[PDB]
């Protein structure tokens, strides 16, 4: 199984708050991060059999790796599928310049199956173009929209930083190591519970991980697009950690 190529073809959703319920296992890199009592609190992205990429703020207030478990291959949030892989975390690596991104080393390698496949990493320092339609997935808050309890997806366009940072929108808050995605009209967004999961953009024949869900001014509000850590600016760090640990 090559990276970024689901064995169930994803549904499109032109037009997680809003969006739609994903086809089961069409996002086989989506991870659920769980407390010791099994509560989902963040997403993550499998990027190789032993490594999950997530957001630093999902973990930083409880650094000990035994505090976390990783659920792979799931579609429902509760009452997990039978062949779901639950794997413990052996090591945690926070990004050294203190961006909102972090690596989890799994205590044993995930078994790569038709339901558990890594996303591809982008080219270093690639800047996803303005208006590129990408996909954001997770089990987070739906703000009254349908699909709570099931893996949801939002199809949202990238908004280039120079637009997103305008006074009327996020007013200078967005760093070059972040990107914006969403509809400025509002209505569709990642929300609480989605942090740490993927924003992927289809390129040629596979999905490339371009963002890590991070923050926003609320969710799905007009003029307030979601902010994601820009993965391409950390590919060298990610590959260094994986090769040396």
């Amino acid at each position: 199984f090559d990276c970024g190529k689901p064995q169930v073809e994803p549904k499109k959703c032109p037009g997680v708050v809003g969006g739609c319920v994903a086809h089961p296992h069409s996002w086989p890199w989506q991870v659920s991060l769980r407390t010791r009592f099994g509560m989902h609190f963040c997403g993550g992205t499998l990027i190789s059999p032993e490594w999950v990429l997530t957001a630093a703020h999902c973990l930083e207030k409880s650094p000990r790796p035994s505090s976390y478990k990783v659920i792979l291959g799931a579609h429902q949030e509760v009452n997990l599928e039978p062949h779901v892989q639950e794997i413990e975390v052996s090591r945690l690596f926070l990004e050294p310049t203190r961006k909102d991104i972090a690596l989890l080393k799994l205590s044993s390698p995930a078994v790569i199956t038709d339901k558990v496949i890594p996303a591809c990493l982008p080219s270093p320092n690639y800047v996803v173009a303005d208006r590129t339609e990408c996909f954001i997935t997770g089990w987070g808050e739906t703000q009254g929209t349908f699909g709570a309890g099931l893996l949801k997806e939002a199809q949202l366009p990238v908004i280039e930083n120079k637009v997103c940072n305008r006074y009327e929108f996020l007013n200078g808050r967005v760093q070059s190591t972040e990107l914006c995605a969403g509809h400025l009209a509002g209505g569709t967004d990642s929300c609480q519970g989605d942090a740490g999961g993927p924003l992927v953009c289809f390129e040629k024949d596979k999905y490339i991980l371009q963002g890590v869900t991070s923050w926003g001014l609320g969710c799905a509000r007009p003029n307030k697009p979601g902010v994601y850590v820009r993965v391409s600016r950390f590919v060298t760090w990610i590959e260094g950690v994986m090769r040396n640990n």
Binding site: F41, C42, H57, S214, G216, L217
Partner: peptide, 14 residues
């Protein structure tokens, strides 16, 4: 006004 999107979220006055 930032809310980081964990569950529960990490929110600030900014």
């Amino acid at each position: 006004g930032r809310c980081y999107k964990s569950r529960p979220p990490i929110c600030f006055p900014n």
